[PDB]
């Protein structure tokens, strides 16, 4: 860099110039590339950040940081409080808030600008707990649209989350999977410190500023060099807002290192935390006062958003891999509030991940982390499908750290706070407030995930979003206008409706049943149950649509309905309703090993019992539980070969408990439940439905594919005074994606009775319906009385099982 060029008239230039020409942009300090005069011209500090009575009407001294002269408004370089001190105006916070029904912008403005005020480590509970010291932020919150909290992505670190906010993508898809990373294809590393993080090969997807530029919307630069003070960042944004209509950007970003920086040292609620919250609020006040001076305070949309929260973590709460592993020098550990382990050297052929996992599995009674092969991580975390995420992962308990050896903790107590844990943990939750003409007025919205904002910021700017992991329309309820009006995806495969086409004797399945037991009253009645008379009861929200090319059958029964796949030889889904009044019955002795041919489905597209006998590892279970049959005659339907699915005996303990106990418990507590359950196949852990040829495992000697997971979607009336089957209003849902595993090594207390561990496992693997759609290629809730945007919101809902 030949720094002999100048920054005269180029301060915070929006277009970056190429080396070895010197730079004057808001990033030049980070690349050590600024022109010699950058500090003098662009980082002026003289006389402070606020006008004073004496300075009012002064003679323009260009050296001053901000100006109090009469001409300053037209130059667009006044101090933010100029009109308060020198013209008797009020601070924006002291004004009563008034609905902004339409953009009230200066002439020339083609759209409301968007300003994103991002705050590092701004824990959700600070909005309540620090409300007395943050009046500007509290005005934004209460007069704008706010959520009680926003759910970050895993890992709940700064870079993964800022780039998820920028792109709408899960870290596995955008590539910033941690604050620290190794890419084995590049043979490069990425760190917070240093120069390799500036290379564009690390950064996938399309962040907002590129989406804007590519579509003719001009963007301020989002990144700010750490040395540039906050007051200067604000003044720069206000200066840009004063630019000519053909140069002025439409989207802007501010970033604060606080309260994260203090929160690390002092803990999330340390008494030292009050001051950082005062300064952030003061900065917001400066922005809104500056906007008001420029008559932009009822034109611009302001987003106040955080990347993650902050938890209490100290050095004494550190698990050391040295107290579990003998071989601790043959591994590399990405440490901290999560753990990622790989081999220290790829030439070491004695390195076995299986032995390492086993040595970290349930070894101490209070063990404050749990090891996982990455594909066994809860699917809600979507943290697997990247070569940068190590095969071995440690999910660390909230409040704790994992390190390799004790020397790493005392040769690196200092910190009292940290983050990075599971994104369902309360302490990791962060904030969202939207304020402006396109946002709603004094509106609370439910919690939502940060992956959803990319779309909304595209809507706010009139942009078409790049393909991302948001569900577009699920956050339309934040907006007065500029809503995106989505359509249901078209069904690709239509079902067959097979009647009775096969004789018992055509089947040679090795299956037996004790069912040779014999009337016109109840033969016409059961006929109509196989044509779909109780389908109104058991399929409450329409049949799910299959959104890919396949061959399947709708099978009707008294207690349940299924979409049976001829390719996978099992239901893709099974739907049934259990009212509050329904009764659990036992599986009778004569039917214990009963499997019956389904006369509507060919032998060739059926499973068989012989495969299950020959497979000593694999057993089988049922999607509609026999336990909940409506009558002894109806119970025979639950033993059909078309209701059967492959299950490991270790997983059957879980499934049986869910089906026998929990389904009824949920129907009691929620006033009936509709359950839709089924298999999932994700052998390549991309979070997406596997095609046939991706299946790595079959029931031995057969074409019966083995699920990697089993799902259920449990729906009822949000108004729980109405029964699930007759609900007039909004729905309530919770779902799960249980891993289909041949042991229960994940559950350290699995030797005990299922009532001590099963429900706990299901909670860990809670899921959004949208997760299940991605994984199955199905589309649920097709026929309701509710708006589609409300259904989209419901589909992205996650039941977290955390307290308030
Ligand atoms: C979350 O949202 C995202 C975004 O919508 C979803 O991710 C998408 O999923 C698609 C389906 O899996 C995927 O589509 C593929 O695109 C391939 C081309 O990809 C490049 O171009 C895109 C578009 O600009 C770009 O975004 C991509 O960037 C990825 O890769 C670079 C690294 O080079 C990273 O910088 C970046 O972070 C991103 O990485 C992530 O995605 C890749 C996969 O693309 C993962 O491997 C990484 O781990 C990481 O997660 C790329 O630059 C295209 O080549 C594919 O086509 C193959 O498959 C089709 C199937 O129809 C087949 O018919 C074709 O023949 C073709 O196969 C050929 O190659 C095979 C393998 O080499 C071989 O086996 C065959 O024999 C053939 O030769 C495919 O169309 C799309 O790229 C990603 N997009 C992103 C941004 O990730 C994600 O699904 C959502 N998540 C959930 C849960 O819903
Ligand atoms: C990363 C990343 N991806 N995209 N962006 C730009 C961006 C997007 C938005 C958005 F909200 F709109 F998306 C909104 C704003 C932006 C601009 C982001 C920006 O100016 N910076 C991010 C950052 C800077 C400067 C310096 N950083 C640290 O050194 C740092 N590191 C680790 C931790 S911690 N607490 O985790 O240990 C804390 C830290 F402060 C991170 N930054
Ligand atoms: Ca898959
Ligand atoms: Cl990390
Ligand atoms: Na078996
Ligand atoms: Na166990």
Coordinates of C-alpha atoms in Angstrom, one line a residue, residues 657 749-750 752-761:
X657 CA -43.3 -44.8 26.0
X749 CA -30.0 -42.4 32.8
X750 CA -31.5 -44.9 30.2
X752 CA -33.8 -46.4 34.6
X753 CA -37.5 -46.5 33.9
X754 CA -38.5 -44.6 30.7
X755 CA -40.4 -42.0 32.9
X756 CA -37.0 -40.6 34.1
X757 CA -35.4 -40.0 30.6
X758 CA -37.6 -40.4 27.5
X759 CA -39.5 -37.1 27.7
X760 CA -36.1 -35.4 28.4
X761 CA -34.7 -36.9 25.2

